[PDB]
Amino acid sequence: AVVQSELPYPEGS
Amino acid sequence: SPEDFVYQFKGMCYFTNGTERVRLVSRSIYNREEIVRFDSDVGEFRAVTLLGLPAAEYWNSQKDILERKRAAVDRVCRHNYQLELRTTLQRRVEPTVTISPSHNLLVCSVTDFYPAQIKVRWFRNDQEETAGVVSTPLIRNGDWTFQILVMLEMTPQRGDVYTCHVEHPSLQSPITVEWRA
Amino acid sequence: IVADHVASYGVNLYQSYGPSGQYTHEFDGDEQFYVDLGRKETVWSLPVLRQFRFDPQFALTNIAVLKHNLNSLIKRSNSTAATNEVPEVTVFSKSPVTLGQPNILICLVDNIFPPVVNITWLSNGHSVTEGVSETSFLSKSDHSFFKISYLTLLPSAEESYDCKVEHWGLDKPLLKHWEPE
Amino acid sequence: MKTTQPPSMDCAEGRAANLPCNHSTISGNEYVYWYRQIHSQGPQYIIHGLKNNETNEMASLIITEDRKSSTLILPHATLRDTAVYYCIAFQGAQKLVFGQGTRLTINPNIQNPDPAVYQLRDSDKSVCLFTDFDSQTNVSQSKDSDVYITDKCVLDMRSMDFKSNSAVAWSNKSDFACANAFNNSIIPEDTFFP
Amino acid sequence: GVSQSPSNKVTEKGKDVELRCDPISGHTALYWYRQSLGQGLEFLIYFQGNSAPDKSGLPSDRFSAERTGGSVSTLTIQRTQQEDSAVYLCASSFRALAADTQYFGPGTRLTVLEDLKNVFPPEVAVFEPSEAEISHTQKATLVCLATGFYPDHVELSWWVNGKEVHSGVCTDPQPLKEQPALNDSRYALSSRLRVSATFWQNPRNHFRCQVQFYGLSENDEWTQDRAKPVTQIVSAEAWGRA
Ligand SMILES: *[C@@H]1O[C@H](CO)[C@@H](O[C@@H]2O[C@H](CO)[C@@H](O)[C@H](O)[C@H]2NC(C)=O)[C@H](O)[C@H]1NC(C)=O
């Protein structure tokens, strides 16, 4: 079993 | 005193009544200010603060990014909750009771228990005492155990039997510890 | 804001100071695991959880996105730096004190921001190194942190301890004393 | 979860092309992705979906309710849709993997076949051009060396709405006559040699 | 779209080659692949921002990648070998490990040779339409033949009256080896241009077959007494005939 994680997304620079 | 710029991202899941209610709130924080969040109940990005407005504008315009976020409630929250049902939600640590005289004060120490739900009652000669008890808040030890101390304002006599009564989900029956002088 | 259980499936931290980062998962206020970003391995804080797997590259790529978003917010906010908060330190024992019995000294450092702190133990005029451990920076609702340091000890009538805390919000290092009483 | 596709398919130009894909062991977090690669350039992203049905300006994607199979639909096939089409189950991972894909061929609708072989002069001496044959027939290589026969490829004169298949053959030895050079193929009998 | 340069690279073994990739604006994840045919997509390395968490997947230590700026990335192959020849594909997405759509570039076809001795430019020749074809079908098909080139890095185009044309053209999708048995055989390519009878019968219509050959450069040194098979354009023209 693998743990799942939320992912942030890039923005701007 | 050095300068510092801090950024935080919290992918938080909120569970209620088992799997009946599940909610995902992903928070983007600059310093101590949440600037933009994705709340699964609304289903799209929402700026929390003025600074998070350009981020919410950009992300909400990408259908691909919007797809993965709406599925993260199922991919992340619900998936992990099945892992928690067999692990952390099974964790049961029996509280350790201990009475220590402080006589006119009595302290029942309930140490090293999990989960947090606890119920502590004092007993003086089968009569429960509520007018003279004072309890510390629920203390988190940080090592997946809790503790709580309940002090007792008492007046001893010859023949008194003080009993501490503790209830915990790890217990089939409450714990009782007595003290005599 | 109200639920039966709250979980942080991703506590992502990145700050310009080091630059340093932190990645953890939290459930009901306790650290499930952290990722050693330097060693690229997952370190589980609960023995029952070692049966699972978590790819550290999820943490490594998450922190790299935060590094990106941080530089964006630094620019957008005209270099608005973090405010130093005054941490709150309290020291207490994991179990009741008995001069014979082993115990654990808990030093709770609350209201930490920014997440940069030094926690050291002092006993009778010298620093203590053997038997001290630390939790990672644990998240709070107000987006500050708290951190807990442990010191395994054998209480003695003549041995007193101090928890030394260094933080930019403090004008001098804070020492919290603990006496075996 | 892996995907399976028919190795090769044919479709007539101007008709909707339906490409099937099987993925019974697909998981809830795996998207159905479609790429195509024209010989022999970079892969082109077509469309993708999770559970719903999606529609691009390029194609449509129909996913069954149980997500165990999917269909890519090219709305109005042209010669430009001749490529290898890859169906992939894609989830959080660095590597995207291509299977064998479907070798999709879009055949031109030849109104009036007029098979013929011609001889052309240099502006060595001659080459043999076998053109205007039917898409059903396929050309063959020559066992003899120094006589060359390239595979057929479809010509498109868009200014005339006319399309034609053609193969080119040439040689400098054996006093090559534009007769019997293509005979190793299954060319029709109605073909004429000037 | 994703940009890549150079489009073609022919190099002698032992030389270092540098591939360039320009990801889509706003894509912080960048991927490197290489592809032989017949062969599949071989993963090499990926970048999140300016860092590559996955250094494995590279074929050997002679391969190294960089994305220092966080945008454009470069892949370097030091002391190239025979087995390095492939089409190196680049891709980019919003983010890595998120199942984001990966968009590819045109690729760089790399060919590494043991020696440059068999390298030679193509010979282009245009063939005028058949008299029987013009009489029977009122259509004129002219054929171009690029022969005797090695390696197979050629781009053929038709030019009518100084303007490139695409209608009425069909080029063989893949070159064929002239000596199929030999290991280091040379290649040949054919293409057809079909126009109307009246357009060909016009003597003022100009037809040119252009073949772009990718070979050596000004940096590469040549030892033979023959012409240095450099990257060049070889053409063959024909005029309309009455
Ligand atoms: C925690 O302790 C470390 C080391 O005791 C401190 O690091 C020093 O910081 C000063 C001022 O920034 C530098 O001049 C020194 O070179 C540092 N020492 C070393 C060994 O690198 C650090 O400042 C302390 N943290 C806090 C918040 O006080």
Side-chain angles (χ1 to χ4, degrees), chain A, chain B residues 1-102 104-126 128-181, chain C, chain D residues 2-110 112-120 122 124-125 127-172 177-182 184-185 188 191-194, chain E residues 1-181 185-217 220 222-225 227-242:
Chain A
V2 61
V3 177
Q4 287 278 343
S5 69
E6 237 290 73
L7 310 182
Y9 274 74
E11 168 263 287
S13 52
Chain B
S1 184
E3 200 175 60
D4 196 18
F5 305 92
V6 176
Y7 196 94
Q8 288 175 78
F9 175 77
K10 302 172 168 184
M12 309 189 70
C13 302
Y14 297 80
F15 305 103
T16 313
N17 216 129
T19 11
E20 152 190 330
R21 183 80 178 98
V22 185
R23 185 183 183 172
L24 165 66
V25 180
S26 296
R27 315 183 186 270
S28 291
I29 302 113
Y30 177 57
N31 292 327
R32 299 196 40 187
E33 276 274 42
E34 186 181 350
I35 66 182
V36 57
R37 80 164 60 112
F38 179 87
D39 188 352
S40 74
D41 284 7
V42 354
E44 61 181 46
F45 288 94
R46 229 68 152 182
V48 188
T49 220
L50 221 68
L51 284 177
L53 208 42
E57 293 267 323
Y58 167 68
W59 291 330
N60 282 335
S61 70
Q62 305 304 311
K63 80 177 195 310
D64 286 9
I65 295 177
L66 231 46
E67 281 175 45
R68 281 94 178 118
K69 286 299 174 173
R70 286 157 183 173
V73 207
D74 299 329
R75 176 186 127 261
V76 177
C77 298
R78 286 197 168 94
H79 174 88
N80 290 347
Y81 190 83
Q82 294 303 299
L83 301 194
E84 310 296 349
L85 281 175
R86 299 135 43 181
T87 53
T88 56
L89 296 159
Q90 298 287 56
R91 179 186 177 74
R92 308 270 212 273
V93 182
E94 293 182 14
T96 297
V97 303
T98 280
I99 302 185
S100 60
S102 180
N104 60 329
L105 207 70
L106 226 50
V107 187
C108 179
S109 295
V110 182
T111 62
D112 303 330
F113 59 89
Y114 192 91
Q117 203 194 35
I118 195 85
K119 194 52 193 64
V120 180
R121 300 180 182 90
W122 268 109
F123 275 92
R124 177 194 185 275
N125 293 314
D126 264 15
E128 186 175 350
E129 300 280 318
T130 55
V133 299
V134 47
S135 176
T136 75
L138 181 60
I139 298 167
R140 179 186 302 272
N141 296 328
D143 60 357
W144 290 87
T145 70
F146 295 95
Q147 81 177 287
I148 183 169
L149 313 183
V150 176
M151 292 87 175
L152 166 66
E153 186 75 30
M154 65 153 193
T155 51
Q157 82 209 34
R158 295 194 210 273
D160 274 350
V161 188
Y162 296 85
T163 304
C164 186
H165 189 270
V166 180
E167 297 185 81
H168 193 257
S170 70
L171 304 172
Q172 287 278 79
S173 181
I175 300 181
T176 52
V177 51
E178 292 169 51
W179 181 87
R180 296 150 186 267
Chain C
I1 192 174
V2 172
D4 287 341
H5 308 283
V6 61
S8 286
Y9 291 134
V11 162
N12 298 254
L13 173 60
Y14 187 79
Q15 55 189 339
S16 59
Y17 168 64
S20 48
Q22 184 184 275
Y23 188 85
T24 49
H25 278 217
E26 298 174 3
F27 187 90
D28 281 350
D30 295 315
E31 185 183 356
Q32 291 187 317
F33 69 89
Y34 77 89
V35 177
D36 193 318
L37 306 166
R39 300 196 68 187
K40 297 178 181 190
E41 72 173 293
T42 296
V43 181
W44 303 90
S45 304
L46 203 54
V48 68
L49 294 178
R50 287 163 192 168
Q51 72 184 278
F52 296 136
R53 301 277 105 95
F54 186 73
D55 195 353
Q57 298 191 344
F58 282 97
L60 291 166
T61 57
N62 271 30
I63 301 308
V65 173
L66 289 214
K67 177 177 183 190
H68 180 99
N69 289 358
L70 179 59
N71 282 318
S72 183
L73 266 296
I74 294 176
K75 176 190 171 187
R76 182 178 294 116
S77 70
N78 196 17
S79 285
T80 302
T83 291
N84 296 332
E85 284 280 349
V86 171
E88 180 190 61
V89 183
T90 143
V91 178
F92 53 93
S93 60
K94 178 176 168 60
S95 63
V97 180
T98 302
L99 295 194
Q101 308 291 338
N103 211 328
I104 293 179
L105 291 188
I106 300 177
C107 185
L108 166 66
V109 186
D110 198 0
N111 199 42
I112 307 178
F113 201 87
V116 175
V117 70
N118 284 327
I119 308 179
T120 41
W121 289 96
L122 302 169
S123 196
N124 295 347
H126 191 72
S127 61
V128 189
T129 295
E130 218 60 33
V132 0
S133 63
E134 250 186 19
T135 75
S136 304
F137 287 106
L138 296 161
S139 68
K140 294 189 69 185
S141 198
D142 59 6
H143 311 303
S144 65
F145 300 88
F146 71 99
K147 180 185 259 275
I148 300 172
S149 185
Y150 306 98
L151 170 61
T152 60
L153 85 168
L154 213 61
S156 173
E158 53 187 53
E159 285 183 2
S160 71
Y161 289 83
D162 286 305
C163 185
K164 190 168 111 94
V165 179
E166 297 181 348
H167 193 268
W168 303 324
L170 299 172
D171 224 311
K172 70 197 66 173
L174 214 178
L175 272 70
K176 272 283 171 172
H177 195 73
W178 182 89
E179 201 120 32
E181 183 181 356
Chain D
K2 261 308 294 174
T3 50
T4 56
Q5 301 171 265
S8 62
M9 290 184 66
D10 282 18
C11 189
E13 58 168 346
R15 302 179 65 81
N18 306 276
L19 300 188
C21 180
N22 300 318
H23 37 75
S24 57
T25 62
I26 198 163
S27 61
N29 296 335
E30 263 166 341
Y31 292 87
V32 180
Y33 265 80
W34 283 84
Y35 287 81
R36 73 180 177 185
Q37 192 185 11
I38 302 169
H39 186 98
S40 191
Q41 324 159 2
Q44 178 185 9
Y45 162 77
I46 304 172
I47 201 173
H48 78 273
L50 187 67
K51 305 168 183 181
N52 309 270
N53 292 11
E54 305 290 341
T55 300
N56 271 8
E57 310 175 355
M58 202 183 304
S60 289
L61 177 57
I62 282 187
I63 301 170
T64 62
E65 231 115 340
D66 57 336
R67 313 216 327 124
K68 295 224 187 174
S69 63
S70 61
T71 305
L72 180 69
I73 298 184
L74 302 171
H76 196 104
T78 75
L79 291 317
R80 284 170 298 277
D81 296 339
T82 293
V84 185
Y85 287 73
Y86 298 102
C87 172
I88 316 142
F90 195 56
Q91 73 176 331
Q94 13 74 55
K95 37 196 300 89
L96 173 79
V97 294
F98 287 166
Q100 208 55 58
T102 298
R103 301 265 290 179
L104 176 61
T105 314
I106 304 303
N107 302 120
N109 286 123
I110 298 196
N112 308 108
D114 198 354
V117 172
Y118 306 105
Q119 195 179 298
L120 290 75
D122 185 18
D124 283 290
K125 262 57 62 181
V127 305
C128 304
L129 167 272
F130 166 53
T131 187
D132 296 359
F133 55 91
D134 191 11
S135 286
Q136 302 289 326
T137 75
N138 289 117
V139 307
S140 160
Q141 295 274 94
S142 169
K143 200 177 336 168
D144 196 341
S145 246
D146 183 69
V147 59
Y148 300 115
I149 298 185
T150 76
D151 200 355
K152 76 173 200 183
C153 85
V154 37
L155 201 294
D156 185 12
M157 294 200 289
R158 318 189 195 100
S159 310
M160 290 193 51
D161 282 331
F162 180 86
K163 305 192 179 72
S164 67
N165 299 114
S166 52
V168 178
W170 72 97
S171 165
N172 63 315
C178 290
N180 178 72
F182 295 77
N184 204 151
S185 301
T191 309
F192 77 98
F193 295 63
Chain E
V2 176
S3 313
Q4 284 189 250
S5 75
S7 57
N8 300 80
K9 183 58 169 178
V10 173
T11 183
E12 203 180 2
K13 70 170 185 188
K15 303 291 292 300
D16 301 6
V17 296
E18 182 183 304
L19 316 179
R20 192 177 183 273
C21 177
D22 216 327
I24 295 174
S25 180
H27 280 184
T28 63
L30 183 149
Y31 310 84
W32 277 100
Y33 301 86
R34 74 176 182 183
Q35 177 186 49
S36 282
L37 281 176
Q39 181 48 235
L41 210 55
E42 193 183 337
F43 177 81
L44 297 179
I45 190 169
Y46 84 93
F47 289 89
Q48 178 58 57
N50 47 26
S51 91
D54 206 333
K55 205 170 179 292
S56 67
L58 305 176
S60 60
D61 48 8
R62 298 177 300 104
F63 289 75
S64 79
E66 286 186 348
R67 200 200 184 192
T68 290
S71 186
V72 169
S73 169
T74 170
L75 175 69
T76 318
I77 311 173
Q78 290 187 287
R79 303 175 305 274
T80 45
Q81 311 277 79
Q82 174 74 107
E83 59 270 22
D84 295 333
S85 305
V87 177
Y88 286 79
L89 291 168
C90 185
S92 73
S93 57
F94 289 131
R95 188 228 205 281
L97 312 188
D100 281 320
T101 299
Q102 297 188 13
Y103 296 89
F104 290 78
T108 295
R109 194 202 275 115
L110 173 66
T111 287
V112 190
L113 310 163
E114 253 72 32
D115 48 49
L116 306 177
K117 303 171 185 181
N118 49 7
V119 185
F120 277 118
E123 283 184 346
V124 186
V126 55
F127 296 83
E128 297 192 345
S130 170
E131 198 83 345
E133 186 204 2
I134 305 171
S135 175
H136 178 70
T137 194
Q138 265 72 45
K139 290 153 189 162
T141 307
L142 28 161
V143 166
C144 185
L145 268 182
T147 54
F149 58 93
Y150 180 84
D152 61 297
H153 296 239
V154 285
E155 290 180 281
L156 192 152
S157 57
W158 282 95
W159 296 71
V160 176
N161 292 331
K163 292 156 282 182
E164 191 180 349
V165 298
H166 304 266
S167 178
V169 182
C170 192
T171 312
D172 294 328
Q174 200 180 49
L176 49 84
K177 287 169 92 173
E178 293 179 340
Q179 324 305 132
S185 174
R186 311 247 286 268
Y187 293 79
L189 182 69
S190 83
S191 182
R192 317 110 179 88
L193 173 66
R194 195 165 206 183
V195 294
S196 63
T198 59
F199 195 92
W200 162 252
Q201 289 167 355
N202 196 319
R204 299 172 175 178
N205 283 331
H206 179 79
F207 303 82
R208 185 174 59 90
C209 179
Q210 192 182 274
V211 172
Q212 240 293 337
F213 176 71
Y214 292 92
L216 306 188
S217 65
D220 297 3
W222 187 246
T223 57
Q224 272 187 249
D225 60 76
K228 182 171 86 170
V230 78
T231 293
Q232 65 190 260
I233 281 177
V234 189
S235 292
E237 59 174 44
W239 288 90
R241 184 172 315 281

